[PDB]
Design a protein around this ligand. Structure first.
Ligand SMILES: CCCCCCCCCC(=O)OC[C@H](COP(=O)([O-])OCCN)OC(=O)CCCCCCCCC
Ligand SMILES: CCCCCCCCCC(=O)OC[C@H](COP(=O)([O-])OCCN)OC(=O)CCCCCCCCC
Ligand SMILES: CCCCCCCCCC(=O)OC[C@H](COP(=O)([O-])OCCN)OC(=O)CCCCCCCCC
Ligand SMILES: CCCCCCCCCC(=O)OC[C@H](COP(=O)([O-])OCCN)OC(=O)CCCCCCCCC
Lengths: 608, 608
């Protein structure tokens, strides 16, 4: 149980001028009651930073108590208190004191002064030696589930996240101690990473994050021109663009990708207008950390490292849409070659399963099946060894890989069982047959007519529905079997399930009426449960949700393209860089991608 | 890869005053750096239009580069550059230079000056000899799929499509070279055709197209009164009204049909108010190119030449609604006579099929069936030979014609098989029987009670559903047959399909549990697929779409009427002209149709 940061109704725990009198004096704003505190500390060789003058559980000092009780942004005890601190000859400054609790670790008085929105307190603390790089690494300042406020752990990041431009300006340009825009917290996050991480998809917050990000970029260009603030990576290796891509923060993501400035801040732009003709606008976009020719690119992060539901809305933005379209058009022939090879392998496997000189052809077909199963096994194992996180974070768009792996495993295990002359090779062969013929439907995503053409529901409510239904099934099965001693529990469950799915009838002997009552109860309960499932499926459709199947199709195609670009396991494909190296101003050479857009509606609004 | 029209970041390809220095001078707006260019061209016998001074891939000249880099609508290098062109004695004028690339063919500097919305540049180019009839026929200026801007290929059409009335006025009335409103592009399209072709159904764009169309009609009446601008046909034989009808541009279509002016522009009207009494308003509408007594009329184009989904919304406008109603009321007796003849032919065919002196009556019935089949065959073949495009562009409202043709073909082929004494005549006879009795439902469109009473879905998702379902069926069938060696693949597919549609049961032998598992998997997968189809059918209905079955009924009746007006194949019907010849002002005699409307809501708003 963390204690409150400031409580008007609870005294601080402890786990002549004492702590209680000092706290009561600094909480009312009268400095004249501080007379005699310095002499007591000098006589007792005491300091106003030790455990006796601070809260025992946290370490909150009298300075922090004074800043927590501001009166119109100013407290009259802060300067006298720091004067007593200076005159006492304290080796450790009171202005740079931090709490030691695991909940408020690193929290200082400058953080409180910034949070209370008082430029006077911040100015007064900086002049007396406040460190502007003190990191608040407690659990209250980390982003997790519960009561927390993550802002980047830094005073400058706290000022930027709270919309205080005057505080940011004073922290960046002061004669005493300039704050650094390149400063990082415990996670390696800069102020731009912090602005990305506090961003949700709400419009007001998006406008806030965009404004603060643009202003900090401009002031960084004005103050530290030689360094690139957007090229700094945190401990996960992510730039703010990559961090926006991973966390699904769509608005700051589209703002960073399509950032255009006119005038002195033109080098800070990532989109450069090339030429306009009527409703045709042709622009050049920066491909820095966007093109997949580097590792850990934005495309790779969106496809295989993000878990947000905004992924399909992220691949339809420019320049990502045209880039993925060009990559797909480059890889159309490779996709359908794989489809044709898989179709031939299914055809051979089907012929061999149907026909289970003729002996030689059958052996050749069997060894072709074995080699194809080994190839599909090693290909899927390579995919899982590379991308074990992708299946975990998003099962809804990667279950075909598990199906291919299962089909390859069943094929190989059926063939080795056949070589050992076990008769059970045929069931596994026909299971591989049906599984591969189902797996042929993966390649329907190559066409728009078939790729766009309940999956979210059956991955979400299937386990709960199964729980309720097998509770019903097991109870009625044990009731029917124990009344018939229907021979075994599995037989009764099978009969009830086959009747429920319409595959068979019900067998109706003493106590026939009770058996009939049990059957009526089971049938009505299953009807109610299936009606519940049917209502749950009406719930998603009738609520008028816009059609996202096209963007989901482009996400599927992006995943397919980013897999085909690496080549096969046995032969790696050479990576080719997209865009061209062009100079966009002062020599600032960037790899740019040309995107041409036609928008009649936007153009006609500009027409006078 | 077409090069950019103007790139601030890429130099032009090439596939002392040179091209690079000249381009750099004309792109900054300083003419004083042009000193010495004329002497170099005179000494080298060079011209500023050759391949050495233009872009190699396109042919873009220095003049076009100068106009592409305007500064507040004016560039100070254009007049000195044209002065050097005049003094150099160039046989071909620089002001009339065009690009030669397949993407920008015919594109000149006047087009750029109009697109940049600079009256000063247009005036300066016209005074120095710019041709106002230069046609930009490149792929960027044709309407297709991709990056393009179609405007009519002409400078006047470009000015009209971009909402520049001052530019249109200057191009039409200037002392140097007057542009012609009768000028056509490569497709024969005038400026009115171009305004129709750039029209979509959005309200702002519709208001734009209406305003420009009306202004150009008024200025054409003021400038060239003796000619009719709306009577000009392009290379497809379409007037702007017919082009609006074919392309489905509903707003400009209703504006052209119901155009009413008061005062001097009264001859430009197509709707003339005759008399008003309370909420009753009675008007006269022009029937020029609207009545079907001419060929290629608006009714013919809407019914059989348009593919837009706005066709049913086009036949409910005045005067088309009352015209089609009058034609239908004139052709009610002809429709039900055809229905009665077809009903009698079905009755005879049914009696003969049921009864497969009695021999003579059976032979007479058989030859009556044969003659009726020949008549229906030749009637449908005539329909297809006339209207092969109509079935292709709209299958949803013409499949009954294919069904009638199929029924006639099966009838004739069954009769010739019967004459050859092959026993297989009876299956084809009963197929013709059921097909004709289904085809009897075509005539339900004659009544409002039955004509208004999923078809879009089963013509759109049927192929995709069949693909997925026969993938399921074929895989489970080969798995079941290869596990039973269920005797053949077709037998197993038939059994599974019959169980799926409820027509039969499932036959359940070694490996019975694996057979059961395959059957469970197939049943659950088919349940999921049918549930997907059911959800897809909920999607259209619950989204609150307005009832368009009445307008779809009138479209069906319009198709029926426009077919009955031509008569039968053996006897052509005489065409009668609708409306009456009346003088509507200065002698301007038009064939007019009287339409009476009652609108209480519109009338009461005018009441003070
Ligand atoms: C014995 C084969 C040895 C390798 C020879 C070259 C085979 C072609 C390689 C190939 O194109 O892969 C085809 C297909 C790829 O599956 P996927 O990763 O696209 O799907 C991934 C979906 N998640 O994978 C298959 O279909 C395997 C078929 C193996 C036999 C191929 C017969 C034709 C040879 C030219
Ligand atoms: C355990 C073995 C049997 C179950 C696996 C069945 C094999 C896969 C067949 C399948 O899922 O159908 C694929 C089809 C299109 O997939 P997609 O575009 O959503 O691309 C895939 C990524 N979303 O989707 C549909 O047509 C809808 C019907 C889906 C069938 C039931 C769901 C099966 C989930 C395992
Ligand atoms: C042997 C017939 C020789 C011609 C004699 C005159 C027959 C009447 C002609 C007629 O009205 O056509 C009837 C019907 C028309 O079909 P449809 O174009 O309306 O439908 C088009 C739908 N898309 O087409 C038919 O039903 C064919 C029936 C032929 C026997 C008629 C028996 C009654 C004779 C008076
Ligand atoms: C291959 C032979 C068997 C299939 C053809 C069936 C013969 C035609 C029967 C039919 O389509 O029903 C006609 C009826 C009204 O048609 P309509 O007003 O939409 O006018 C027709 C123009 N839209 O529409 C309905 O009542 C709805 C039921 C439709 C039946 C299934 C659709 C068949 C499509 C071929």
């Amino acid at each position: 149980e963390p204690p409150p940061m400031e409580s008007p109704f609870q005294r601080e725990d402890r786990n002549r001028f004492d702590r209680d009198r000092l706290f009561s004096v600094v909480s009312r704003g009268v400095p004249e009651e501080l007379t005699g505190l310095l002499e007591y500390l000098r006589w007792n060789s005491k300091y106003l930073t030790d455990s006796a003058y601070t809260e025992g559980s946290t370490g909150k000092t009298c300075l922090m108590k004074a800043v927590l009780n501001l009166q119109d942004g100013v407290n009259a005890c802060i300067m006298p208190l720091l004067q007593i601190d200076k005159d006492s000859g304290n080796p450790k400054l009171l202005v740079n004191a931090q709490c030691t609790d695991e909940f408020y670790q690193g929290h200082s008085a400058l953080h409180i002064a910034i949070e209370k929105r008082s430029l006077q307190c911040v100015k007064l603390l900086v002049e007396n030696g406040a460190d502007v790089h003190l990191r608040a690494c407690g659990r209250f300042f980390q982003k997790h589930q519960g009561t927390c406020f993550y802002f980047g752990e830094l005073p400058l990041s706290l000022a930027a996240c709270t919309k205080q431009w005057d505080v940011v300006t004073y922290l960046l340009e002061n004669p005493h101690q300039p704050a650094s825009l390149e400063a990082t917290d415990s996670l390696g996050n800069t102020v731009l990473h912090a602005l990305v991480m506090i961003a949700d998809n709400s419009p007001e917050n998006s406008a806030l994050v965009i404004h603060m990000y643009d202003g900090l970029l401009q002031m960084g260009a004005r103050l530290c021109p030689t360094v690139q603030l957007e090229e700094i990576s945190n401990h996960q290796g992510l730039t703010p663009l990559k961090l926006a891509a991973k966390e699904g923060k769509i608005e700051i993501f589209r703002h960073i990708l399509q950032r255009e400035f006119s005038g002195p801040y033109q080098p800070l732009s990532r989109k450069f207008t090339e030429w306009c003709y009527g409703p045709v606008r042709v622009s050049l976009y920066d491909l820095s950390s966007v093109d997949s020719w580097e590792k850990n690119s934005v495309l790779e992060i969106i496809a295989f490292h993000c878990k947000s539901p905004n992924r399909h809305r992220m691949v339809v933005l420019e320049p990502l849409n045209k880039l993925l379209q060009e990559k797909w058009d480059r890889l159309v022939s490779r996709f359908f070659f794989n489809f044709a090879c898989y179709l031939v392998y299914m055809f051979i496997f089907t012929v061999v399963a149907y026909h289970q000189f003729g002996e030689s052809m059958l052996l050749l077909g069997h060894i072709l099946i074995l080699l194809g199963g080994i190839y599909l096994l090693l290909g899927q194992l390579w995919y899982f060894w590379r991308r074990r996180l992708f299946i975990w974070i998003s099962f809804m768009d990667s279950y075909f890989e598990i199906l291919f792996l299962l089909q390859a495993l069943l094929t190989v295990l059926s063939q080795v069982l056949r070589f050992m002359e076990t008769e059970w090779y045929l069931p596994l062969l026909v299971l591989s047959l049906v599984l591969g013929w189902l797996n042929l439907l993966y390649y329907t995503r190559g066409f728009q007519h078939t790729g766009i053409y309940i999956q979210k529901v059956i991955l979400r409510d299937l386990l709960r529905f199964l729980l309720v239904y097998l509770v019903f099934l097991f109870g009625f099965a044990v009731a029917l079997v124990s009344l018939s001693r229907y021979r075994s529990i599995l037989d009764a469950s099978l009969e009830l399930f086959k009747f429920t799915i319409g595959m068979g009838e019900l067998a109706f002997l003493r106590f026939r009426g009770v058996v009939l009552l049990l059957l009526l109860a089971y049938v009505l309960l299953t009807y109610v449960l299936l009606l519940n499932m049917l209502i749950a499926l009406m719930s998603e459709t009738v609520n008028h949700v816009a059609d996202n199947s096209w963007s989901i199709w482009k996400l599927q195609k992006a995943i397919s393209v980013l897999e085909m670009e690496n080549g096969y396991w046995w032969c790696r494909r050479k990576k080719h860089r997209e865009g061209r190296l062009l100079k966009v101003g002062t020599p600032d050479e960037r790899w740019c991608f040309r995107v041409e857009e036609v928008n009649w509606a936007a153009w006609e609004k500009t027409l006078p």
